Each structure stands twice: as C-alpha cells, then as structure tokens.
Design a protein around this motif. Sequence first.
Motif, PDB file in Angstrom:
ATOM      1  N   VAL A  23      40.563  57.369  37.149  1.00 22.02           N
ATOM      2  CA  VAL A  23      41.627  56.452  36.892  1.00 22.02           C
ATOM      3  C   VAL A  23      41.143  55.380  36.131  1.00 22.02           C
ATOM      4  CG1 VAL A  23      42.427  57.254  39.253  1.00 22.02           C
ATOM      5  CG2 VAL A  23      41.107  55.002  39.251  1.00 22.02           C
ATOM      6  N   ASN A  24      42.231  54.600  35.631  1.00 24.48           N
ATOM      7  CA  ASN A  24      42.008  53.330  35.070  1.00 24.48           C
ATOM      8  C   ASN A  24      42.370  52.540  36.149  1.00 24.48           C
ATOM      9  OD1 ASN A  24      41.566  53.195  32.022  1.00 24.48           O
ATOM     10  ND2 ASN A  24      42.808  55.032  32.438  1.00 24.48           N
ATOM     11  N   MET A  25      41.505  51.391  36.519  1.00 28.17           N
ATOM     12  CA  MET A  25      41.542  50.178  37.161  1.00 28.17           C
ATOM     13  C   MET A  25      40.983  49.077  36.608  1.00 28.17           C
ATOM     14  SD  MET A  25      40.229  50.518  41.210  1.00 28.17           S
ATOM     15  CE  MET A  25      41.072  49.308  42.388  1.00 28.17           C
ATOM     16  N   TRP A  26      41.767  48.426  35.580  1.00 28.92           N
ATOM     17  CA  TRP A  26      41.046  47.335  34.773  1.00 28.92           C
ATOM     18  C   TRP A  26      40.504  46.346  35.809  1.00 28.92           C
ATOM     19  CZ3 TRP A  26      42.355  42.398  34.918  1.00 28.92           C
ATOM     20  CH2 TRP A  26      43.613  42.019  35.518  1.00 28.92           C
ATOM     21  N   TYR A  27      40.995  46.049  36.788  1.00 28.87           N
ATOM     22  CA  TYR A  27      41.061  44.789  37.541  1.00 28.87           C
ATOM     23  C   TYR A  27      39.737  45.006  38.699  1.00 28.87           C
ATOM     24  CZ  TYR A  27      43.750  47.628  40.851  1.00 28.87           C
ATOM     25  OH  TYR A  27      44.190  48.758  41.535  1.00 28.87           O
ATOM     26  N   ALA A  28      39.146  46.131  38.636  1.00 31.86           N
ATOM     27  CA  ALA A  28      38.117  46.475  39.697  1.00 31.86           C
ATOM     28  C   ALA A  28      37.008  45.561  39.730  1.00 31.86           C
ATOM     29  CB  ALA A  28      37.661  47.960  39.770  1.00 31.86           C
ATOM     30  N   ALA A  29      36.514  44.899  38.788  1.00 30.57           N
ATOM     31  CA  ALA A  29      35.625  44.051  38.904  1.00 30.57           C
ATOM     32  C   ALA A  29      35.981  42.509  39.446  1.00 30.57           C
ATOM     33  CB  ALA A  29      34.726  43.784  37.622  1.00 30.57           C
ATOM     34  N   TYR A  30      37.342  42.114  38.868  1.00 30.95           N
ATOM     35  CA  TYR A  30      38.021  41.002  39.275  1.00 30.95           C
ATOM     36  C   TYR A  30      38.140  41.089  40.856  1.00 30.95           C
ATOM     37  CZ  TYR A  30      39.625  38.493  35.159  1.00 30.95           C
ATOM     38  OH  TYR A  30      39.730  37.617  34.112  1.00 30.95           O
ATOM     39  N   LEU A  31      38.471  42.443  41.318  1.00 33.27           N
ATOM     40  CA  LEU A  31      38.619  42.486  43.000  1.00 33.27           C
ATOM     41  C   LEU A  31      37.330  42.110  43.619  1.00 33.27           C
ATOM     42  CD1 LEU A  31      41.364  42.995  43.838  1.00 33.27           C
ATOM     43  CD2 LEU A  31      40.533  45.427  44.301  1.00 33.27           C
ATOM     44  N   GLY A  32      36.263  42.440  43.141  1.00 29.51           N
ATOM     45  CA  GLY A  32      34.759  42.165  43.561  1.00 29.51           C
ATOM     46  C   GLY A  32      34.527  40.651  43.574  1.00 29.51           C
ATOM     47  N   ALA A  33      35.165  39.752  43.094  1.00 24.10           N
ATOM     48  CA  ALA A  33      34.641  38.372  42.952  1.00 24.10           C
ATOM     49  C   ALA A  33      34.739  37.909  44.492  1.00 24.10           C
ATOM     50  CB  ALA A  33      35.702  37.515  42.096  1.00 24.10           C
ATOM     51  N   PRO A  34      33.664  37.014  44.415  1.00 23.55           N
ATOM     52  CA  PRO A  34      33.315  36.427  45.918  1.00 23.55           C
ATOM     53  C   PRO A  34      34.107  35.240  46.161  1.00 23.55           C
ATOM     54  CG  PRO A  34      31.733  35.504  44.352  1.00 23.55           C
ATOM     55  CD  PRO A  34      32.493  36.471  43.456  1.00 23.55           C
ATOM     56  N   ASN A  35      35.016  34.603  45.288  1.00 23.91           N
ATOM     57  CA  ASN A  35      35.794  33.477  45.413  1.00 23.91           C
ATOM     58  C   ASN A  35      37.294  33.987  45.768  1.00 23.91           C
ATOM     59  OD1 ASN A  35      36.492  34.262  42.867  1.00 23.91           O
ATOM     60  ND2 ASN A  35      36.145  32.413  41.783  1.00 23.91           N
ATOM     61  N   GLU A  36      38.203  33.296  45.578  1.00 22.05           N
ATOM     62  CA  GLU A  36      39.702  33.361  45.621  1.00 22.05           C
ATOM     63  C   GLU A  36      40.284  34.404  44.977  1.00 22.05           C
ATOM     64  OE1 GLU A  36      38.474  30.229  44.614  1.00 22.05           O
ATOM     65  OE2 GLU A  36      39.313  29.950  42.724  1.00 22.05           O
ATOM     66  N   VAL A  37      39.584  34.545  43.582  1.00 23.86           N
ATOM     67  CA  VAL A  37      40.158  35.532  42.820  1.00 23.86           C
ATOM     68  C   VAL A  37      39.664  36.919  43.494  1.00 23.86           C
ATOM     69  CG1 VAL A  37      39.901  36.256  40.581  1.00 23.86           C
ATOM     70  CG2 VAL A  37      39.603  33.968  41.063  1.00 23.86           C
ATOM     71  N   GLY A  38      38.901  37.239  44.085  1.00 26.04           N
ATOM     72  CA  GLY A  38      38.664  38.509  44.703  1.00 26.04           C
ATOM     73  C   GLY A  38      39.450  39.000  45.743  1.00 26.04           C
ATOM     74  N   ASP A  39      39.305  40.064  46.139  1.00 25.76           N
ATOM     75  CA  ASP A  39      39.653  40.791  47.352  1.00 25.76           C
ATOM     76  C   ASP A  39      38.745  41.923  47.707  1.00 25.76           C
ATOM     77  OD1 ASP A  39      41.071  41.721  49.362  1.00 25.76           O
ATOM     78  OD2 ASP A  39      43.194  41.870  48.619  1.00 25.76           O
ATOM     79  N   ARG A  40      37.728  41.673  48.340  1.00 30.40           N
ATOM     80  CA  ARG A  40      36.489  42.481  48.312  1.00 30.40           C
ATOM     81  C   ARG A  40      37.081  43.653  49.431  1.00 30.40           C
ATOM     82  NH1 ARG A  40      30.675  39.424  47.840  1.00 30.40           N
ATOM     83  NH2 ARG A  40      30.904  39.469  45.690  1.00 30.40           N
ATOM     84  N   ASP A  41      37.397  43.123  50.594  1.00 33.42           N
ATOM     85  CA  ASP A  41      38.127  44.087  51.682  1.00 33.42           C
ATOM     86  C   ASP A  41      39.132  45.103  51.104  1.00 33.42           C
ATOM     87  OD1 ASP A  41      37.043  42.802  53.825  1.00 33.42           O
ATOM     88  OD2 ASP A  41      38.578  41.804  54.443  1.00 33.42           O
ATOM     89  N   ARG A  42      39.773  44.488  50.190  1.00 31.74           N
ATOM     90  CA  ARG A  42      40.698  45.519  49.223  1.00 31.74           C
ATOM     91  C   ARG A  42      40.062  46.661  48.353  1.00 31.74           C
ATOM     92  NH1 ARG A  42      44.956  44.471  44.450  1.00 31.74           N
ATOM     93  NH2 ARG A  42      45.303  46.759  43.837  1.00 31.74           N
TER      94      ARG A  42
END
Length: 410
Positions: A23-42
């Motif tokens: 799949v394309n998931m352009w934002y997967a690294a953004y989701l890994g961010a440790p700050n308020e930008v990320g959503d590591r649980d997701r």
Amino acid sequence: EHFVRVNGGHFELQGKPYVITGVNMWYAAYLGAPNEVGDRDRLAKELDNLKAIGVNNLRVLAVSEKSEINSAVKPAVTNGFGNYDETLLQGLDYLLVELAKRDMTVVLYFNNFWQWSGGMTQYMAWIEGEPVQDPNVTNEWEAFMAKSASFYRSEKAQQEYRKTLEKIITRVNSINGKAYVDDATIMSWQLANEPRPGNSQTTAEEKQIYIDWVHAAAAYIKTLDAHHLVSSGSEGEMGSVNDMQVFIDAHATPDIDYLTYHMWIRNWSWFDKTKPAETWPSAWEKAQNYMRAHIDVAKQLNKPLVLEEFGLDRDMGSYAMDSTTEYRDNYFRGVFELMLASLEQGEPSAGYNIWAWNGYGRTTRANYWWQEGDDFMGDPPQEEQGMYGVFDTDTSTIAIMKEFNARFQP
C-alpha cells in the motif's frame, strides 16, 4: 541483513522470489513522530492490520518541504534549506523499527513533483523568493508542471536535493542504532513521487534534461549506498510526456534497479466518476493496454515492474466512509487478475501498491479538507480525505486485498 535484491525480472529476498503486495501510506513516518504530530499507538495498530491483510510493503514519503499553501502537509521536515526537523526524522526511525518487527519493507521517496509535500515547486519558491502558486487555487496545471520541472535545470536546487538525499541516506537510526544503509527494512530509495519532464509542451531538450536527471540522481545515490535498490517513482509513459522512449531512456541506466508505473484512470479522464457505468468499459480497455505496454518495456529492459500507485474513486465520487466502492473493487480485481496471470507466465510483473491506505484514520470535516492536527490519511492534504483511501471499514475492498496478497505470494 537480507536486502531485497533484483535478479532479472523479479525481486529476491534470501534467494527466494519476493513479490510486492503493498500500500501507499505516505504519512507512515509522520505517524511515528514522538511529539504531538505523531500517533504511535495508531501506527502499530495500522501495521498490525496491514500485516494481517497480507501487506508486506509500504511506499512512504521520506521528506517534505515547508509550505504556506493549504494543500500541503504541515509541519514539514525541511524548514528552509538545510533546516531539518530531527524530531520528525525520529518518526522515520520509529517506522523502520516497527516495520522490522513485522518483516515488512518500505520504499522511501525523497521529493514530489506535486505540491502536497512542498516538493519541486517549493525548492524553486525558496530559490526565487516567490510564493508557491497552489494549482488547486489557480487551476493552472500546465504552468505548475513547467515550474515543477524547472527544478531539474537549477544547479542550486540539485545541490540542495543531493544534500537532502545525503541527510537521510547517511542517517543512523536513533532508536536501534542501525545505519540506514545497513537496514534491510528499506527496500528502495526512490528519487521522487511522479517526477515528470514538464507539461504537455515539453521540448526535446527538456526531455533530455529529465533523462539525464534520473541517471545522475540514481548514480549519486549509488555513491552513498551501493547495495539498496533505487527507483525513480515515475508514472510510466504518462509521466514521460506520453513518450515511451523517454521512459525507456530514463530508466535504461544500471543505477535504476527496477521500474515503476502508476495508473490514474479518473485523473487521466479515461473514467468519469459521475458516469461510471458509461465510461468504465473504455477506461478498462485503456488500463489493460497501459499495463501491457509497461510489461513489454520491462521485458525490453529486463527489470522488475511494480504498479506502485493506482486507485479509483468511491462510487459516484463520494468521500463518505459509508459509500460503496463497487467500481474501485472491480477495478482492483481486474488489475490483480491480469497481473497475477502475467506473473504466472514469468513476465516481470513484480507486484503493486494500492493508492492508498486510510485505515483507522478519520475526518470529521464537512468539506473533507485536511487541516493541521487532523488525522493523516492515505489521501494527502491536496485532496479530499476519502477520495482514494481505503478505510479499515471498507470490508469488500480489504477482502480483495487479503485474497490477492495471498495469491501473489510465492
């Protein structure tokens, strides 16, 4: 340890065939961010669901450039030339850790022809000291494409691009300590998302500039990393000013390890999302011809071919999560059927990445338009949230993915 490698028209992993079911998931690294930008649980939950669906590969944006248009991701990795957000880059580190746990790989692209991550026109805007003109606002797409392609001709832009390539490729994963060049989780470095030579009026000289850019950028990456695969991110013939020889010539270098093509049957006006029954037959004829044309070129060049980006609107162009996806689903079935037959017959069809994955992401915007802070979706900020992305609740589509992801596996 065990890198994805190329042998003729197929990929290998530990000497056994490897087929991309992605799949394309352009934002997967953004989701890994440790700050308020990320959503590591997701992120973990998304990767768990994707793995359960048979997905082995993500195609992901590595870097974005700061933009003040309202069709682009915010915040950005690059806040003016050389000014990299290390906290956001830790999100890429985290993604690579999470993928490695699940034996998934990633294709990482380093720029964008289009505006949604800043990309080539944002380089030029910084160089020229003039604001980007969002083509969603101007509707001046021919002008936009010429501007974006002017990136190849700018020695300053190329210097800054090579610095970005080097910044990421020479990175050490801050979490696990792996040098990126040593991480087999990375399948491929990719020059850009959909680099094109220019607009409909591209000159022969501009075609050659593009060809030489692909060659030189790929060669440059190989000086930093002799052993990861390199690809361009091209759409194919449609991303080559409709000149298949430009596609061939650009990708004839040994520094391009495999070929990409994309299909956008609605954007290309083959399919009308508001008149799907009327236009689908002809759209499908054109799509199968496009597939066959690119498979033939892959045979000519003796390289694997990945349909790394393709998608279709929900029924009647709805963005609503509860709308049906019959046309998309049947599209996907047709593509998967043809590709699987191609693979069975020993042709260089080496897999696919659907555009795109929304998963557990949600919008509650009435106009479906992303704003900073909203869930990231497979639909990037330049398109309605729900246009092309597959939600976790898209049961029919997911069943088709799960079926073919299994059937494509050796």
